[PDB]
Amino acid sequence: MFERFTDRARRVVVLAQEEAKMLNHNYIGTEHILLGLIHEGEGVAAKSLESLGISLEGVRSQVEEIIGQGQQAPSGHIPFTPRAKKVLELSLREALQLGHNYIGTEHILLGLIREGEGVAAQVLVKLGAELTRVRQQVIQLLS
């Protein structure tokens, strides 16, 4: 599935893994994907999130409250949570339905919203960003 990703989408997932590592987390969850979308900085997802007032520090703060720093450094390669796998699979489906044969940062964010149930979704709502508004912003920046 990674072979469909744009270079900047690949960067999102790489940064998600680095954020999980920094937090001493044992899985790449949806919240790490959200942090990766922000860290990537330049894509439609990052720009959408900046527009909606969703900051790297706000998300990190929420993740610290909900999950907390782990005590032991994990390995270089961290597995995805089931929910994060689902998000990636849905990102593909978003792209396909919109007529794209590639997965960009926009599609990863749309997939995160489509899944809508995991830690990232909980954090977005806690930070004042209803999922529906997030999708509209993405679609808007795309149009």
């Binding site: 599935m1 690949r10 270089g76 390669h77 995805f80 796998k85």
Partner: peptide, 16 residues
């Protein structure tokens, strides 16, 4: 990869 056992090239883990 999208599973568990050993390191994918870039991100995640995979099984045999």
């Amino acid at each position: 990869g999208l599973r568990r056992l050993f390191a994918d090239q870039a991100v995640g883990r995979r099984n045999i």
